[PDB]
Amino acid sequence: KAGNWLPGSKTPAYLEDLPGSYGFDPLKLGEDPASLKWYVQSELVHSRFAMAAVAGILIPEVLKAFGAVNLPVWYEAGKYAQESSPIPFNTLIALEIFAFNFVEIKRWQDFKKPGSQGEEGSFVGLEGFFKGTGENGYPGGVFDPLGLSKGPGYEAMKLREIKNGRLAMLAFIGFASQYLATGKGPIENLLDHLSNPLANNFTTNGTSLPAQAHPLLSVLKP
Amino acid sequence: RASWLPGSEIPSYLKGELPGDFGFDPLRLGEDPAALKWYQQAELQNGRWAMLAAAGILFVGGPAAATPWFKASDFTYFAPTSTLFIVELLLFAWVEVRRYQDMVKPGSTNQDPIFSQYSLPSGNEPGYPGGIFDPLGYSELKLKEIKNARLAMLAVLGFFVQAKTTGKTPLDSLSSHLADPWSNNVFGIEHAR
Amino acid sequence: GETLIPTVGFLYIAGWIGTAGRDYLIASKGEAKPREKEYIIDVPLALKISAQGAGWPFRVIRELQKGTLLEKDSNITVSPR
Amino acid sequence: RALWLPGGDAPAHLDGSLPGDFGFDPLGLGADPERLAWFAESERVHARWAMLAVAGIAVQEVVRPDVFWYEAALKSPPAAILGLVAFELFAMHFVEVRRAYDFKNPGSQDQDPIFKLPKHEVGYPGGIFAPVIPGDLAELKLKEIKNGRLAMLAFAGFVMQAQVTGKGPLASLGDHLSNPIGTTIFSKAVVIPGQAIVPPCMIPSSVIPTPCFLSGLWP
Amino acid sequence: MKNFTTYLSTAPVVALIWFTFTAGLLIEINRFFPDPLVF
Amino acid sequence: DRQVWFPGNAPAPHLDGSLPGDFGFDPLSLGSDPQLLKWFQQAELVHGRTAMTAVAGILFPAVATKAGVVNIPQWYDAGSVWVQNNPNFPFAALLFIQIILTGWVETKRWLDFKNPGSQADGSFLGVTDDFKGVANGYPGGKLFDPFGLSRGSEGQLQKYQENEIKNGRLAMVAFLGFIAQHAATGKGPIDNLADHLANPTAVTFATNGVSLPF
Numbered sequence: 001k002a003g004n005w006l007p008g009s010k011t012p013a014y015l016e017d018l019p020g021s022y023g024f025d026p027l028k029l030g031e032d033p034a035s036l037k038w039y040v041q042s043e044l045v046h047s048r049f050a051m052a053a054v055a056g057i058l059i060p061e062v063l064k065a066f067g068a069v070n071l072p073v074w075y076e077a078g079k080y081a082q083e084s085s086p087i088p089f090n091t092l093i094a095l096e097i098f099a100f101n102f103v104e105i106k107r108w109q110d111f112k113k114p115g116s117q118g119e120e121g122s123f124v125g126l127e128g129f130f131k132g133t134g135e136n137g138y139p140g141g142v143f144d145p146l147g148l149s150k151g152p153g154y155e156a157m158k159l160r161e162i163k164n165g166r167l168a169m170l171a172f173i174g175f176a177s178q179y180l181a182t183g184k185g186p187i188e189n190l191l192d193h194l195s196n197p198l199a200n201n202f203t204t205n206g207t208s209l210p211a212q213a214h215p216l217l218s219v220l221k222p
Numbered sequence: 223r224a225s226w227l228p229g230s231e232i233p234s235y236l237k238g239e240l241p242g243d244f245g246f247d248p249l250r251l252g253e254d255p256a257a258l259k260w261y262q263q264a265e266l267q268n269g270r271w272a273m274l275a276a277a278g279i280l281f282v283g284g285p286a287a288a289t290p291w292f293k294a295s296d297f298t299y300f301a302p303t304s305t306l307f308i309v310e311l312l313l314f315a316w317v318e319v320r321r322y323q324d325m326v327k328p329g330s331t332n333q334d335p336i337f338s339q340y341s342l343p344s345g346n347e348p349g350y351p352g353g354i355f356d357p358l359g360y361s362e363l364k365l366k367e368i369k370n371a372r373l374a375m376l377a378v379l380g381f382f383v384q385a386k387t388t389g390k391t392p393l394d395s396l397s398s399h400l401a402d403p404w405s406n407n408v409f410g411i412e413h414a415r
Numbered sequence: 416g417e418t419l420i421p422t423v424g425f426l427y428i429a430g431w432i433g434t435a436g437r438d439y440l441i442a443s444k445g446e447a448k449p450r451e452k453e454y455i456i457d458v459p460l461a462l463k464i465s466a467q468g469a470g471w472p473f474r475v476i477r478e479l480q481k482g483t484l485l486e487k488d489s490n491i492t493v494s495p496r
Numbered sequence: 497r498a499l500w501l502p503g504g505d506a507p508a509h510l511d512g513s514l515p516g517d518f519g520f521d522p523l524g525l526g527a528d529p530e531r532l533a534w535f536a537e538s539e540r541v542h543a544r545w546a547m548l549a550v551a552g553i554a555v556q557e558v559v560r561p562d563v564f565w566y567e568a569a570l571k572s573p574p575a576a577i578l579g580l581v582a583f584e585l586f587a588m589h590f591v592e593v594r595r596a597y598d599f600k601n602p603g604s605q606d607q608d609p610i611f612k613l614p615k616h617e618v619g620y621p622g623g624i625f626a627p628v629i630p631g632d633l634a635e636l637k638l639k640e641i642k643n644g645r646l647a648m649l650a651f652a653g654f655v656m657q658a659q660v661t662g663k664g665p666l667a668s669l670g671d672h673l674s675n676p677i678g679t680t681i682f683s684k685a686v687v688i689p690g691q692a693i694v695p696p697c698m699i700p701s702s703v704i705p706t707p708c709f710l711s712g713l714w715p
Numbered sequence: 716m717k718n719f720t721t722y723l724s725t726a727p728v729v730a731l732i733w734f735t736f737t738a739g740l741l742i743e744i745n746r747f748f749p750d751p752l753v754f
Numbered sequence: 755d756r757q758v759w760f761p762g763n764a765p766a767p768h769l770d771g772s773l774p775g776d777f778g779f780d781p782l783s784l785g786s787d788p789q790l791l792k793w794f795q796q797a798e799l800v801h802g803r804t805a806m807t808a809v810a811g812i813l814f815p816a817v818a819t820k821a822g823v824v825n826i827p828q829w830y831d832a833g834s835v836w837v838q839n840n841p842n843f844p845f846a847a848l849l850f851i852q853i854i855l856t857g858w859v860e861t862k863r864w865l866d867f868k869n870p871g872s873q874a875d876g877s878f879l880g881v882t883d884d885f886k887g888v889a890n891g892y893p894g895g896k897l898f899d900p901f902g903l904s905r906g907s908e909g910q911l912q913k914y915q916e917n918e919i920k921n922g923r924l925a926m927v928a929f930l931g932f933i934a935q936h937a938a939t940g941k942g943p944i945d946n947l948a949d950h951l952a953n954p955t956a957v958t959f960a961t962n963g964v965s966l967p968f
């Protein structure tokens with residue numbers, strides 16, 4: 001186990017060997033093993049989506065703060081890309097539906113029957129791409145072109161993926177909540193916090209602590 | 223045994239096998255043997271590029287050799303800035319895949335691809351090759367290299383931070399500190415914002 | 416906000432209440448005196464089960480697919496037809 | 497053994513091995529062995545530091561009678577103060593961690609790290625630090641700790657006398673010798689039920705904040 | 716104290732405590748957020 | 755046996771004299787269950803230590819204010835004065851910081867109560883022995899007891915435990931007195947003591963005007 005999320009608590013035995021495990025399941029969602037396998041895949045998929053999304057938000061924002069690029073902010077990039085997009089909105093949705101239906105059905109079929117997308121005659125001659133590794137959530141093949149899963153740092157890279165994945169998931173939800181609460185981008189929120197941490201935080205954004213539910217805010221003030 | 227802190231406990235995985243082994247690992251970073259081998263190679267690589275960088279920064283007449291090193295990219299050459307980046311990327315890609323393949327399987331990249339008679343001698347270490355990389359038989363010397371590499375790494379970091387806060391060249395920083403050291407140093411300069 | 420979101424909120428709380436009650440009843444079924452826990456409440460157990468009812472849809476859906484949510488028809492009493 | 501309270505009883509954890517041991521520990525602060533060793537090192541360094549401080553303040557009062565020792569840092573021979581702080585911190589850090597790893601690992605810090613020190617006692621360096629010894633070991637240890645405790649008490653007196661009088665130690669002694677009945681703390685400070693007379697502190701509140709040490713609880 | 720807490724765990728006492736909590740929660744929500752018709 | 759709170763009455767049978775401050779006082783038998791009794795022992799210790807710190811932080815600033823050296827506000831006004839003097843520090847930010855810090859330390863104390871010595875595994879910054887705990891409500895170690903007054907001798911530890919529990923109960927009663935006296939006089943406690951010292955036969959609860967609303 002990587003550790004204990006709550007020192008002194010009794011950690012569940014079914015999480016003892018999973019990568020990235022801190023024994024954290026107070027709601028007992030993963031007590032059933034089939035549920036646990038499904039949730040391991042779901043956590044990895046959420047982690048990788050959030051990882052790529054937080055990269056595609058933070059790196060343009062960091063390079064914009066450094067004066068390098070001037071790409072649009074993340075919550076308005078849909079509008080600016082759509083006007084210049086040669087493909088209209090409805091066609092983009094239909095294409096995304098088709099492509100993700102295909103790839104997610106292939107991933108789902110591999111989850112139910114491991115290695116079944118790599119068998120002979122499975123794909124149209126290209127089935128060697130998708131042989132799998134016998135590990136839930138770690139496909140390999142085309143998805144591991146450099147073959148770094150065969151190296152000796154593979155187990156530590158699994159742990160690195162999950163913890164960075166959880167951090168990225170929290171970060172994207174923070175991006176969305178910060179936009180909804182302040183109306184500014186994430187780097188501007190960080191700079192405002194760095195300028196005055198006591199006064200520039202969630203307790204003063206006027207949304208996170210609703211005024212009706214917290215009457216002492218309008219009272220205990222200068 | 224020499225150590226960075228005489229009189230303290232030494233980690234059990236650092237027994238002087240490696241050069242420059244003074245038991246310095248307060249954060250216990252490289253514990254598993256794959257990590258320690260990778261960080262050995264990375265220390266060698268970063269230290270050698272930092273030795274070259276410290277030399278090339280301290281060495282710099284001529285209009286080009288009067289420019290700051292952090293403003294050096296704005297000098298005009300025979301190619302646009304994009305072209306040299308990709309050419310350097312290509313040459314580095316070739317030599318780095320050679321060095322990486324040596325790092326994975328030792329002795330795998332020892333033979334000249336176009337000359338079958340020209341081959342690096344066997345028993346080659348990953349970070350310590352032989353043959354045409356050692357034209358003289360100069361090979362105690364690894365402690366010297368790792369010490370100069372670490373000093374150059376700290377020097378290059380000092381170049382980067384000094385050009386970031388004061389906005390000054392390294393020679394200007396040394397001359398400012400040599401004017402009055404008790405007022406022109408990291409204290410006072412940063413305390414004057 | 417008029418009916419649909421209240422429908423989701425009610426159904427979440429109602430499934431929470433029902434799942435907590437079912438969990439408490441199942442846990443009490445294994446005691447030596449199962450009827451005693453029905454009118455003298457095991458309050459720490461009830462509070463623990465009540466807290467765990469937040470994750471009810473996941474557990475209930477897994478019981479549905481696994482086949483453990485429902486008792487088999489051969490184990491349930493019926494009157495003569 | 498001579499005891500701080502004759503006719504009394506020394507505590508069990510104070511056997512008498514340490515120099516200047518008179519069985520004075522009513523709080524039981526040294527009733528742990530490793531705490532007793534650490535507190536012995538602390539008392540030694542406090543004694544020597546207060547000893548040098550009392551000597552230096554007395555000399556500064558004698559030599560430069562126009563300079564208040566409390567405000568002696570205003571008159572010290574403007575951004576160069578930060579560099580001197582850096583030099584002092586570096587040198588003090590080096591010598592202090594040398595002493596501390598002498599304490600933690602006895603004999604490990606007993607060799608010159610540039611070009612050696614004899615085997616000695618923890619807290620008693622010897623070697624180059626002790627070139628001449630005009631006496632015996634236990635006797636001079638007793639003198640060192642007694643003079644050190646006297647100097648610690650004297651430095652506390654120097655500080656609080658500077659607060660309540662605004663003047664140096666020998667000037668305060670001269671004021672006491674001029675009027676022995678109207679210069680003591682009993683002479684100017686009185687608290688009775690219903691009325692308290694608290695003498696003011698002549699040191700200003702700030703210059704850098706310069707608070708009088710617990711002046712609101714003065715008698 | 717064990718017998719007293721067993722009495723406090725009898726069904727009507729638990730019902731009283733739980734419904735006092737639930738009714739108080741509903742009352743205080745409607746005091747702090749008066750007249751909620753829609754979400 | 756030992757001295758009891760009501761002489762001539764047998765002490766409460768579930769109290770046996772092992773706990774510090776055991777005078778046999780439990781007329782409602784709230785400590786009948788031993789585990790609930792250990793929980794109430796930790797409750798009493800936390801209440802008493804908090805009361806001692808708070809009573810010190812009221813009495814010493816009020817004594818210094820009464821002397822005229824400083825102008826620290828009375829304890830019932832200090833939050834208002836602080837908020838009026840700190841407009842760049844909002845009340846909610848201060849409350850959030852206090853809640854997360856006390857949550858960390860109190861959850862560590864709670865988990866040690868549930869599993870004694872379980873915070874000794876080195877998860878918090880490598881701390882092992884200093885978080886093991888000596889007894890229920892008495893952590894000890896080199897962090898909570900850095901002068902080592904619990905590791906000297908047994909009788910010294912029992913003496914200090916008696917001192918702690920008796921001063922803690924006195925400070926709890928004193929804070930109750932602070933609340934009652936402020937409600938009855940509208941002044942601070944040192945102001946009350948000074949008014950009583952100036953004229954004791956006239957300055958009594960009977961003449962404050964609210965204890966006897968006749």
Ligand code: CHL
Nearest residue numbers: 074075076077078079080081082083089090092093096104
């Ligand atoms: C994670 C997906 C996602 C999220 C969070 C957003 C969020 C946003 N987009 Mg973008 N978009 C997203 C995906 C896409 N957008 C666009 C195209 C645009 C345009 C053209 C514009 C935006 C704008 C906006 C903002 C307007 C708010 C809004 O309308 O709510 C939408 C809220 C969402 C949560 C997104 C949609 C719901 C969901 C996340 C879709 C994906 C769910 C899966 C398909 C479910 C599949 C089920 C499986 C099990 C079979 C908002 C910040 C605009 C705005 O800023 O106005 C100035 C703007 O003009 N988006 C496309 C191309 C088809 C997407 C493809 O996935």
Ligand code: CLA
Nearest residue numbers: 432433434435436437438439440456457460461462464465
């Ligand atoms: C464990 C609690 C529990 C659960 C999971 C169910 C579930 C069900 N009930 Mg049963 N019911 C309960 C308690 C419960 N009931 C009690 C206490 C009574 C006596 C009032 C009934 C009387 C009853 C009737 C008369 C009918 C049902 C029906 C149903 C079914 C449809 C849902 C419904 O109509 O809800 C309606 C539920 C009620 C009207 C009573 C609910 C009372 C509370 C809210 C539930 C009890 C909570 C419990 C005390 C929590 C303790 C847990 C704690 C200690 C941890 C479903 C099988 C219907 C049917 O059979 O459908 C096919 C039907 O006609 N129920």
Ligand SMILES: CC1=C[C@H](O)CC(C)(C)[C@H]1/C=C/C(C)=C/C=C/C(C)=C/C=C\C=C(C)\C=C/C=C(C)\C=C\C1=C(C)C[C@H](O)CC1(C)C
Nearest residue numbers: 418419420422423429430431432433434435436437438475
């Ligand atoms: C009892 C208990 C036990 C445990 O504990 C758990 C729990 C969960 C709690 C529970 C369970 C249960 C059961 C299983 C259920 C199932 C059922 C049936 C089968 C359904 C059908 C069948 C159903 C179906 C028909 C349905 C529905 C449909 C309709 C149209 C709807 C509509 C809509 C909605 C959307 C909403 C909105 O707003 C409106 C409307 C318009 C109204």
